[PDB]
């Protein structure tokens, strides 16, 4: 009576049914791929691509489909926001339906392989017992793997035949799926260099093909074969688990730290961007330029794109979220409606006061207004018995340039303090928290969720490698 | 006719452990699930 945690060990020595069980897993994965996509498409709003991006709508699979090219939809809408003139068979819905049909086909294939498990192919010719030439099996699979890798990078990514990959400006203000050209240089190893993807996939692909030929031709060393139990299926399983958990960590870091493969306008902005004021510096930069040109403060702030300002918001920060705060980013803060405009806080003396932005590590941060020198000149005191920086005594007035409150000045202590609290959270945008009944708490972006899930899987798979690997090394002792 | 055909085995203690675990885990995450 196999224990519950040893029931799937029945096919360990049944190559015919091993394919079947693997076919099942592949079918389930394919089905979820199309199923989740169909669900997301059914719950996605493409009306506003600026203040309501996919990552704000909590979409997870949609970003990946868009990353490789899928942009139009049979709904007559493009992820760009324009009408899908001809979405074609490869519409978001089409690709989803394809995966679902593939799942079904895999299921029927699994049934056949399960029923007809006793195939002479699995049997070894010398003895007749079921035996798999793991050495060659890896070689043939590696050769095929290399082919696809090179083809994807030299065609789909390059664009010669494939549609292309999603590339965006450093500030993700403007980007789409355009054919890229392999860098083939030192810059090719820059994670934010899109060209690297094509160059790397082409290089890695050709090598993989050659490596596959080697494993197919050259046989394993006698000392290596026994030393690495190259005759054990669990041996490849343990080593394969090591590879998947290794990649998971690399993939997660790429998503968290950001890269050309993780567009900020497809997965949302990275936490480090806010920590370094990436978008904020740009906004102020162009503003200063417009002022240098001679435009009024309103003109400069009016020039600022709402999308750029939207990026400059603690809410879009992926780290600003909770483990059980489930739902789309739109829920918890509302659906962005518009930009109130830049808020300028000035004391009675006329000194310009800057509201210290909330550090990501801080769930709640005290409101502080500092001068250009960096000296606190005003704040909202917790104790008002004898304040020395009270917004009232300092007499701070907030004037909004550009946006909805363009040209609007506020001197009411309460009104100024309200905007000051928003200012510390970055650009002040209008949000509709009624349609979704937002709870008023920030949520994590799909970027953060993906990183958390894959890092967790990676850490667990480490135990899997040690477990299956230990069993292979101590097979004699574990034998029973 | 696969000779590899075997049968799963669940004993009284194993059943109790499983039910206890599934219930304890629910009691622990139920609060967070309802947030």
């Amino acid at each position: 009576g196999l224990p519950w945690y040893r029931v799937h060990t029945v096919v360990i020595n049944d190559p015919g049914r091993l394919i079947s069980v693997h076919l099942m897993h592949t079918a389930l994965v394919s089905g979820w791929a199309g199923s989740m996509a169909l669900f997301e498409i059914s719950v996605f709003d493409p009306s506003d691509p600026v203040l309501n991006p996919m990552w704000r709508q909590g979409m997870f699979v949609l970003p990946f489909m868009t990353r490789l090219g899928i942009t139009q939809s049979w709904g007559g809408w493009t992820i760009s926001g324009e009408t899908a003139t001809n979405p074609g068979i490869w519409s978001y819905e089409g690709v989803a339906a394809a995966h679902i049909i593939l799942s079904g086909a895999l299921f029927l294939a699994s049934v056949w392989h399960w029923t007809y498990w006793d195939l002479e192919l699995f049997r070894d010719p010398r003895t007749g017992k079921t035996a798999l030439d793991l050495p060659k099996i890896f070689g043939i699979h590696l050769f095929l793997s290399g082919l696809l890798c090179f083809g994807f990078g030299a065609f789909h990514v390059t664009g010669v035949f494939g549609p292309g990959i999603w590339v965006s400006d450093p500030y993700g203000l403007t980007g789409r799926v355009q054919p890229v050209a392999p860098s083939w240089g030192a810059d090719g190893f820059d994670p934010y260099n899109p060209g690297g993807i094509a160059s790397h996939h082409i290089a890695a692909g050709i090598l993989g093909v050659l490596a596959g030929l080697f494993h197919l031709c050259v046989r394993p060393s006698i000392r290596l074969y026994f030393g690495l139990s190259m005759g054990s299926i669990e041996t490849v399983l343990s080593s394969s688990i090591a590879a998947v958990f290794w990649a998971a960590f690399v993939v997660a870091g790429t998503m968290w730290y950001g890269s050309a493969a993780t567009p900020i306008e497809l997965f949302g902005p990275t936490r480090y961007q806010w920590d370094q004021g990436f978008f904020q510096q740009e906004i102020q930069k162009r503003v200063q330029a417009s002022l240098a040109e001679g435009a009024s403060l309103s003109d400069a702030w009016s020039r600022i794109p709402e999308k750029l300002a939207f990026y400059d918001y603690i809410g879009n920060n992926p780290a600003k979220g909770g483990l059980f705060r489930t739902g789309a980013m739109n829920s918890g803060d509302g659906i962005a409606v518009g930009w109130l405009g830049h808020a300028s806080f000035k004391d009675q003396e006329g000194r310009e006061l800057f509201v210290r932005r909330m550090p990501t590590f801080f769930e709640t941060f005290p409101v502080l207004l500092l001068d250009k020198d960096g000296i606190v000149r005003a704040d909202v005191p917790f104790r008002k018995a004898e304040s020395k920086y009270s917004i009232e005594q300092v007499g701070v007035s907030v004037t909004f340039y550009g946006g909805e409150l363009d040209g609007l000045t506020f001197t009411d202590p309460a009104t100024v303090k309200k905007y000051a609290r928003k200012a510390q959270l970055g650009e002040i945008f209008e949000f509709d928290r009624s349609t979704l009944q937002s709870d008023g708490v920030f949520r994590s972006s799909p970027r953060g969720w993906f990183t958390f899930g894959h890092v967790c899987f990676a850490l667990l798979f480490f135990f899997g490698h040690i477990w299956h690997g230990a069993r292979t090394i101590f097979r004699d002792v574990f034998a029973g | 006719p696969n000779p590899n055909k075997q049968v799963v085995e669940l004993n009284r203690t194993s059943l109790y452990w499983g039910l206890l675990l599934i219930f304890v885990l629910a009691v622990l995450f139920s609060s967070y699930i309802f947030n």
Binding site: W4 | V7, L10, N11, S14, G18, L19, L25, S30, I33
Partner: peptide, 29 residues
Amino acid sequence: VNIYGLTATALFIIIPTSFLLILYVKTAS
């Protein structure tokens, strides 16, 4: 908290429970 929250808790306290019961009944049989 919503129907989904209760539904999740319900499934987590039902699907696994039933599966265990079936295995024990089969082995007890």
